[PDB]
Design a protein around this ligand. Structure first.
Ligand SMILES: [Cl-]
Ligand SMILES: [Cl-]
Lengths: 8, 150, 149, 8
């Protein structure tokens, strides 16, 4: 998701 | 005995509650996100905090956590003196309010690197504790406690 | 060595207890999670690094070393992520003895707690406050303060 | 429940 805690 | 004194603080964002413990002499903090502020959540947070630093006294954030027999049970278990959070020094209200505003500001500066609020809050704890104001709060708390141990 | 930590993952009651050990003091932080994932390990390292000055983490296995989520958190928090190969074979034994001690303590409290997570935090408290002498909680503050000064 | 985390 392009987030540190959800790279997807 | 001021190396061991902490203050609880509860603030709200995104319909959730951020519970914070502040080490009064250094301004170091620990924090967590919980869905609402219950005696059970507060008690567990304080058990966590006291296993990690030498917590002598906690000033509770409100009268419900001071009354809570679950919170009193955790403070008995962990050997903490549970006290009220009356700002006998009115400078305490301001310090806590300015702290909450700073943390919310940091949270907004990171909020989009994190899918969940809890990640952003821990990023804000990291930034707050490492900020040099020059020593950082994380250096002040270790200095203060080591000085006490020696 | 003031900034060196080792991850360790042990299992109880069908759940996983993730531990970080500060190698020079033996102080520990730990949590209960339903299973070890890169996301859970990454969040625990972000928590740890906001609370102590974490320079290096030796990961507990090769999946956490490889995980790009764990690498992302170690980048975020400024931690050097390293393997956990026991080049000193004494590391194997120290971690295993630690896990046995924690489970012992957990059994000694387990009946004061409804949930395993409370018992694990009681065990963290007893481990870090135990005088072995000084306690691990005293040792870690001593070591870091000495380094700051 | 007579537990620290559940006094009931
Ligand atoms: Cl609430
Ligand atoms: Cl697992």
């Amino acid at each position: 998701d392009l987030k540190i805690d959800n790279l997807d | 005995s001021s190396p061991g004194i902490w203050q609880l603080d509860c603030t709200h964002l995104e319909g959730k509650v951020i519970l914070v413990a502040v080490h009064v002499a250094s301004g170091y903090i620990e924090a967590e996100v919980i869905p609402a502020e219950t005696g059970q959540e507060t008690a567990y947070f304080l058990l966590k905090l006291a296993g990690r630093w030498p917590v002598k006294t906690v000033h509770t954030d409100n009268g419900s956590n001071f009354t809570s027999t679950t919170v009193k049970a955790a403070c008995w278990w962990a050997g903490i003196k549970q006290e009220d959070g009356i700002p006998y020094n009115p400078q305490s209200q301001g310090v806590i309010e300015s702290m909450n505003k700073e943390l919310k500001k940091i949270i907004g500066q990171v909020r989009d690197q994190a899918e969940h609020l809890k990640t952003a809050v821990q990023m804000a704890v990291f930034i707050h504790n490492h900020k040099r104001k020059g020593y950082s709060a994380g250096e002040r708390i270790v200095d203060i406690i080591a000085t006490d141990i020696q």
